[PDB]
PDB file of C-alpha atoms in Angstrom:
ATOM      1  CA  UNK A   1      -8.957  43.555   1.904  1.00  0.00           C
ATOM      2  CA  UNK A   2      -7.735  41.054  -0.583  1.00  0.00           C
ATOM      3  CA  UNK A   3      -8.665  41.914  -3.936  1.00  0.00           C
ATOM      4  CA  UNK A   4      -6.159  39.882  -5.984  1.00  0.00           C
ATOM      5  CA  UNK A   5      -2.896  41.273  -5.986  1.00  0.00           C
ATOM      6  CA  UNK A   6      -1.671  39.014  -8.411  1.00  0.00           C
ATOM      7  CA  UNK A   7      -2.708  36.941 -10.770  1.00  0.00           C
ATOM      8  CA  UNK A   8      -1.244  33.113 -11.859  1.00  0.00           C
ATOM      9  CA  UNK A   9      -0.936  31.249 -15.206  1.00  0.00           C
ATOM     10  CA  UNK A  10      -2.090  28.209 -14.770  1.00  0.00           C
ATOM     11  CA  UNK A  11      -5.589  28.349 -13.450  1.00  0.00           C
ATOM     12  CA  UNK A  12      -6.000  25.315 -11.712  1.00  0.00           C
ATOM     13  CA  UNK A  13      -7.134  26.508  -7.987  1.00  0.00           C
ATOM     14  CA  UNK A  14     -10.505  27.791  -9.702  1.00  0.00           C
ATOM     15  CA  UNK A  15     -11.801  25.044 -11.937  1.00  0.00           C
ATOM     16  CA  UNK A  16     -11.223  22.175  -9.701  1.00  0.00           C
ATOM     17  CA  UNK A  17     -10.292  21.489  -6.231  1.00  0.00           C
ATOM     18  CA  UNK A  18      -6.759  20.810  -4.526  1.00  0.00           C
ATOM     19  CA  UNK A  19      -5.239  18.252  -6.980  1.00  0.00           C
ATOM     20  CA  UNK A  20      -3.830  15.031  -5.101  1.00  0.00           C
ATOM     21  CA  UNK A  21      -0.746  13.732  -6.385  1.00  0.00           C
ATOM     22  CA  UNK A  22      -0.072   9.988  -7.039  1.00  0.00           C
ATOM     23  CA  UNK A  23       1.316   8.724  -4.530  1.00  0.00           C
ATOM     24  CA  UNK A  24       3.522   8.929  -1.611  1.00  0.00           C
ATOM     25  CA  UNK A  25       6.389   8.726  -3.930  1.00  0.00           C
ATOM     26  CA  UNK A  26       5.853  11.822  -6.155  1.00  0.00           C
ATOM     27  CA  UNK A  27       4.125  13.462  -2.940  1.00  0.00           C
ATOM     28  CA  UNK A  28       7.304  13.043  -1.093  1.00  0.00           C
ATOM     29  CA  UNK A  29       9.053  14.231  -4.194  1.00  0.00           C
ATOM     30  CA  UNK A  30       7.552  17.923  -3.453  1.00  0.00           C
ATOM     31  CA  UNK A  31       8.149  17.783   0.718  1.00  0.00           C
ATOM     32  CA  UNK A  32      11.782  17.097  -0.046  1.00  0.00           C
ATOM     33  CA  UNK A  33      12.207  19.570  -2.384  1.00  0.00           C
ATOM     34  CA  UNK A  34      10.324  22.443  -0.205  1.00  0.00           C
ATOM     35  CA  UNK A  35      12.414  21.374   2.647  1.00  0.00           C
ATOM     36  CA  UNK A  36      15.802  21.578   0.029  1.00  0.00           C
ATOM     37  CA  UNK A  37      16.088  25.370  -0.046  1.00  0.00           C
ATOM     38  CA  UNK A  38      19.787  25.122  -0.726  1.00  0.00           C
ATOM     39  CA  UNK A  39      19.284  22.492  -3.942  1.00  0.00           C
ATOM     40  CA  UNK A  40      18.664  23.035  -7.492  1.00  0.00           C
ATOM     41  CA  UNK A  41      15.669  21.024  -9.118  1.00  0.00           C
ATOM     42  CA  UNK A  42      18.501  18.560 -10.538  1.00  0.00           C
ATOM     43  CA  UNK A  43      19.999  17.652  -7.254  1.00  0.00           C
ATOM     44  CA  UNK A  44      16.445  17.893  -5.588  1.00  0.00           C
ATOM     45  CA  UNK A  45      14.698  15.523  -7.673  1.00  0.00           C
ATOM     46  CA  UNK A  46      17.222  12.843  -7.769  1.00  0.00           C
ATOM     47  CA  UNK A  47      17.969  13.890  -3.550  1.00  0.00           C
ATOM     48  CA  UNK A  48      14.084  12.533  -3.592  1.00  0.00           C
ATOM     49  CA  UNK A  49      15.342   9.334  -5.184  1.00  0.00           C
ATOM     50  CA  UNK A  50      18.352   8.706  -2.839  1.00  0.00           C
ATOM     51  CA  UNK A  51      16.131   9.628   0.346  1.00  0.00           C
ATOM     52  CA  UNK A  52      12.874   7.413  -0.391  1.00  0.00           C
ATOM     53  CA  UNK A  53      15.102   4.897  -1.002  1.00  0.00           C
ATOM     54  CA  UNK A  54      16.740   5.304   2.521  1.00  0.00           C
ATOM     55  CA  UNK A  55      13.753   6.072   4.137  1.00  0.00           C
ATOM     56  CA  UNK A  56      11.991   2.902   6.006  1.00  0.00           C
ATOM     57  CA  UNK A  57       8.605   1.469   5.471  1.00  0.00           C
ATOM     58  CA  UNK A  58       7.552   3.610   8.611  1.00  0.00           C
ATOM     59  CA  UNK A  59       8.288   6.712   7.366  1.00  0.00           C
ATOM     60  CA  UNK A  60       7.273   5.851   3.664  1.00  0.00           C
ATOM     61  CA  UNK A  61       3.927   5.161   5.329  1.00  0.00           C
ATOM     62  CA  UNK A  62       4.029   7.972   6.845  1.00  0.00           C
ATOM     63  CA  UNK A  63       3.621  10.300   3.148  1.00  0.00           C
ATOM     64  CA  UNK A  64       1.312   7.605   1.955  1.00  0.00           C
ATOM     65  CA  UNK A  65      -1.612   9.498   4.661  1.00  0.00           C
ATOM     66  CA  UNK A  66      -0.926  12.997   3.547  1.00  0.00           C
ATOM     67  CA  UNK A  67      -1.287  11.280  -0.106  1.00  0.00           C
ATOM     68  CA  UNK A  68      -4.475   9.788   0.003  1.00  0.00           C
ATOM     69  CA  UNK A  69      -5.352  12.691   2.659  1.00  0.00           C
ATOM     70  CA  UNK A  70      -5.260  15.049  -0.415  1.00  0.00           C
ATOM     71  CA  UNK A  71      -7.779  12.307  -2.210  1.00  0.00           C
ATOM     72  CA  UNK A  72     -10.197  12.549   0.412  1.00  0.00           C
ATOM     73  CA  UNK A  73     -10.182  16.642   0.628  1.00  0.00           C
ATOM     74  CA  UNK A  74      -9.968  16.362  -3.597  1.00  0.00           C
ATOM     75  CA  UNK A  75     -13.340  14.080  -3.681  1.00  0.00           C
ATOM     76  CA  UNK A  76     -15.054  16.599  -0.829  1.00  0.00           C
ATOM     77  CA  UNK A  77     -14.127  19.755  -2.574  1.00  0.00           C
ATOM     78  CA  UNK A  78     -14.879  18.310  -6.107  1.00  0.00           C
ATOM     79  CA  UNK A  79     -18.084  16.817  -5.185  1.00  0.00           C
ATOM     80  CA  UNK A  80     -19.247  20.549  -3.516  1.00  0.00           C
ATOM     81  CA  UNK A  81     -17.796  22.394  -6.442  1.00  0.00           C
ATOM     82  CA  UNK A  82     -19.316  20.368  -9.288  1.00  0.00           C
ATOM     83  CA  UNK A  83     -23.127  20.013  -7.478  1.00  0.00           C
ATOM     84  CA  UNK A  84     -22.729  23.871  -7.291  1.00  0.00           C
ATOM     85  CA  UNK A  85     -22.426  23.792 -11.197  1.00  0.00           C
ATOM     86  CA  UNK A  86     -25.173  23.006 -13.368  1.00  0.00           C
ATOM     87  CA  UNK A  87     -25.444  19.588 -15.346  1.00  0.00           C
ATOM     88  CA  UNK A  88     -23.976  21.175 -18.472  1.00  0.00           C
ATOM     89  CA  UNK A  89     -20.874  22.302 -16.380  1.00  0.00           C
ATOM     90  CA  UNK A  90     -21.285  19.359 -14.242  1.00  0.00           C
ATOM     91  CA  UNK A  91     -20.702  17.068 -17.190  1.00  0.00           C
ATOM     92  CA  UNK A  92     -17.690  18.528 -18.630  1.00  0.00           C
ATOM     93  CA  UNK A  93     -15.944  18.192 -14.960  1.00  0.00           C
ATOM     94  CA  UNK A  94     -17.216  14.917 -14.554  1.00  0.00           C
ATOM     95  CA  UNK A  95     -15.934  13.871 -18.307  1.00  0.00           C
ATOM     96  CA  UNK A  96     -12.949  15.119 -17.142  1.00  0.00           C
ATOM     97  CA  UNK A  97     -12.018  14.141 -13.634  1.00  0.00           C
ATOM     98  CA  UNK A  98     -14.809  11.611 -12.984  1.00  0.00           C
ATOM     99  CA  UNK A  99     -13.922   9.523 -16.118  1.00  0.00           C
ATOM    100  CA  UNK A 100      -9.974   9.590 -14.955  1.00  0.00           C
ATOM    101  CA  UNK A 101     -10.453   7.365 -11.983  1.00  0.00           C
ATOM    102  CA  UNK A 102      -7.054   6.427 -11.799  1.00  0.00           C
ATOM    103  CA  UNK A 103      -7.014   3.823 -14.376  1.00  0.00           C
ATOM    104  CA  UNK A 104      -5.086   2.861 -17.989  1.00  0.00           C
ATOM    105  CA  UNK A 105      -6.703   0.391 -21.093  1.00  0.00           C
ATOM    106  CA  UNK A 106      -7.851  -2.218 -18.277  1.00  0.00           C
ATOM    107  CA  UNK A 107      -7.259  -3.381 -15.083  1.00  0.00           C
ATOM    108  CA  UNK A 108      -5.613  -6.337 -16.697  1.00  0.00           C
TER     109      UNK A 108
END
């Protein structure tokens, strides 16, 4: 059936799980700029500025789900992924991933 066709270059939908981005704002960043067809990336990503900012708290609520949706299906398919590995493969995953909790120097 499918036996790759073709290949990719960045090889991030093998090592780890669907990554979830930030937040609604960046997430909405990406749904705009699907949805803008007829838009280069300039006018896109700065379209993305104009139409959060527009956008009510309703509908910025709205991407906020599918954001921390992606979190939820990240943990999931991380957590089966990395038990599936051993401890030595485990650990470099978890040093990875597991030690970026979303977080900078301190919580201050």
């Amino acid at each position: 059936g499918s036996s790759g066709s073709s290949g990719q270059l960045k090889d991030k939908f093998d090592g780890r799980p669907t990554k979830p981005p930030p937040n609604s704002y960046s997430l909405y960043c990406a749904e705009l700029m699907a949805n803008m067809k007829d838009v280069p990336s300039t006018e896109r990503m700065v379209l993305c500025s104009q139409q959060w900012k527009l956008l009510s708290q309703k509908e910025k609520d709205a991407y906020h789900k599918k954001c921390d949706q992606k979190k939820k299906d990240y943990e999931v398919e991380l957590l089966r992924f990395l038990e599936s590995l051993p401890e030595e493969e485990q650990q470099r995953v978890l040093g990875e991933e597991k030690m970026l909790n979303i977080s900078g120097p301190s919580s201050g």
